Amino acid sequence: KRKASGPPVSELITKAVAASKERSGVSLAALKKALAAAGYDVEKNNSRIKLGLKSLVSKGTLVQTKGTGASGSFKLNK
């Protein structure tokens, strides 16, 4: 009955947190802190989270509404 709680951590989650936010939103900075809130402070995972972007359009998971140079305002169904 204590503090730590958070995510399931991959493309099951990049699709779940982007959908677990009630509405649309920007960048690596929104998605990672929702994914690292439990206590696992970000170390080497920084390249691993970063990679997910081409992996999502190539495998067809999130369309990006906004964003250019490692920024991406990712969408699901409206």
- Site residues (CB under 7 A) for DNA? 5-9, 12, 15-16, 19-20, 48, 76
Q: CA-CA distance, 37 to 57, in Å (whole number)?
A: 26
Residue 15 or 75: which CB sits closer to DNA?
15
Q: How far is the CB of 20 from DNA (least distance, A)?
A: 3
Q: Cβ closer to DNA: 41 or 43?
A: 43
Phi, psi of 56 (to 5 degrees): -80, -40
CB of 23 to DNA, least distance (A): 11
**Maximum Cα interatomic distance, the chain, rounded to a whole number of Å:** 42
Q: Tokens for 69, please give them.
A: 């140079």
Say if residues 73 and 25 touch (Cβ distance below 8 Å). Answer: yes
12 or 63: CB nearest DNA: 12
The nearest distance, CB 46 to DNA, in angstroms, is 12
